[PDB]
């Protein structure tokens, strides 16, 4: 379940991810059940903010909403705020 990686605040949904850069394709590859994070491969090098940019691009396209990194800019563990979306909407899109 993706519910272990999401929570809904007044501003939108905080999606908790753990990234691996340099991947063949930017995509969701799993769920980390202990850390409560979605495992996301990112097809970008981890230099000059490029993995962060690609990560945000991917989720902005998926959710149709602005996505910002609220924590973990320089970590593999990142929390993304998906602005103005509900948890129900986020679950629907992640399950596509
Ligand atoms: Na980066």
From Swiss-Prot:
One of its GO terms (cellular component) is cytoplasm. It comes from the Archaea. It holds the Pfam family DUF167. InterPro entries: DUF167, YggU-like_sf. NCBIfam families: DUF167 family protein (TIGR00251). Belongs to the UPF0235 family. This is UPF0235 protein PF1765.
